[PDB]
């Protein structure tokens, strides 16, 4: 009265092209952010070199003012890095936005199969919790993939009956 199946999301996502496209888009966005940060680093290094080339000529007040300007630029860089790659913003949001459609398709397929087969829980075989044994007939990964990408005597007798029916129907 309580049935459990498993999904093995790694294998399923290996068979979805949208997953690879989303990974490529995320990598492209990360590269764009890295290029912007590198441009800011180049500007800051140019400012540092400009201050260094005159550190032995001007007085202390000008040196201190230029150092404060450099520190302000570095703080602006740190703020930009925390905004782009930080723990909240423009990377978590981008990841969630890219993963929302794939999650929608995969979870719609999984929910359809779970409702059809009356499963109460659907574990993930590729998660942190490891199953050393699985009954292998509760694995619904192949059915999910098919949905996304869209007693030998008895078998022999069924094949013979199907052949007879097909041969009878084809000629008439």
């Amino acid at each position: 009265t309580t049935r459990i199946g498993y999904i093995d999301m790694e294998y399923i996502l290996e068979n979805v092209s949208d997953y690879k496209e989303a990974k490529s888009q995320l990598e492209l966005k990360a590269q764009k952010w890295k290029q912007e940060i590198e441009a800011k680093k180049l500007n800051i290094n140019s400012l540092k070199e400009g201050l260094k080339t005159e550190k032995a000529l001007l007085t202390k007040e000008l040196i201190e003012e230029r150092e404060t300007e450099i520190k302000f630029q570095e703080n602006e860089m740190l703020d930009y890095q925390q905004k782009q790659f930080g723990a909240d913003g423009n990377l978590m949001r981008q990841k969630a936005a890219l993963a929302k459609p794939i999650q929608d398709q995969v979870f719609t397929a999984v929910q359809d199969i779970a409702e059809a087969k009356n499963y109460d829980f659907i574990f993930d075989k590729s998660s942190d919790l490891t199953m050393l044994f699985s009954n292998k007939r509760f694995d619904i990964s192949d059915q999910v993939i098919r949905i996304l990408n869209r007693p030998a005597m008895a078998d022999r007798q069924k094949a013979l009956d199907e052949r007879r029916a097909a041969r009878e129907k084809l000629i008439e």
Binding site: M9, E10, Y11, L13, E14, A22, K23, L26, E27, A30, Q31, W33, K34, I37, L78, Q81, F85, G86, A87, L91, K95, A96, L98, A99, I102, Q103, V106, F107, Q111, A114, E115, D120, D124, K125, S126, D128, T130, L132
Partner: protein
């Protein structure tokens, strides 16, 4: 309808974002840092020996089990290489299985002439 409580699936970090453990021998610690180009994305996680060791052993055991059952299953794009280090009890491969004849091809051909 059964009103399922849906979990979640998320993308992993792009390869440009490194995430690694570094051993600092000055204080004898292991620091986990996730950085893009040296900028710590989250808080560093510094642990003692026997604190890094327990987590490393746990993740290594989990990875060993996962790789073994991935090799047993076979449909994971890389399980064929790992099937060699498997106990042959857990899989059957057809490369060393042959039919009554080695293949199903028929190649016996005639040459010459016949006269009436």
């Amino acid at each position: 309808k059964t009103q399922f409580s849906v979990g979640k699936m998320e993308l992993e970090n792009p390869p440009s974002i490194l995430s690694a453990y570094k051993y600092d021998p000055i204080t004898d610690r292991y620091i986990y840092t996730t950085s893009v180009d040296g900028f710590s994305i989250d808080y560093p996680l510094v642990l003692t020996p026997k604190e890094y060791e327990d987590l490393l052993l746990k993740e290594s055991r989990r990875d060993y089990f996962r790789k073994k059952m991935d090799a047993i299953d076979g449909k994971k794009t890389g399980a064929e290489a790992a099937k060699k280090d498997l106990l042959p009890r857990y899989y059957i491969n057809s490369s060393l299985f042959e039919s009554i004849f080695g293949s199903n091809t028929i190649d016996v051909k005639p040459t010459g002439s016949v006269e009436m």
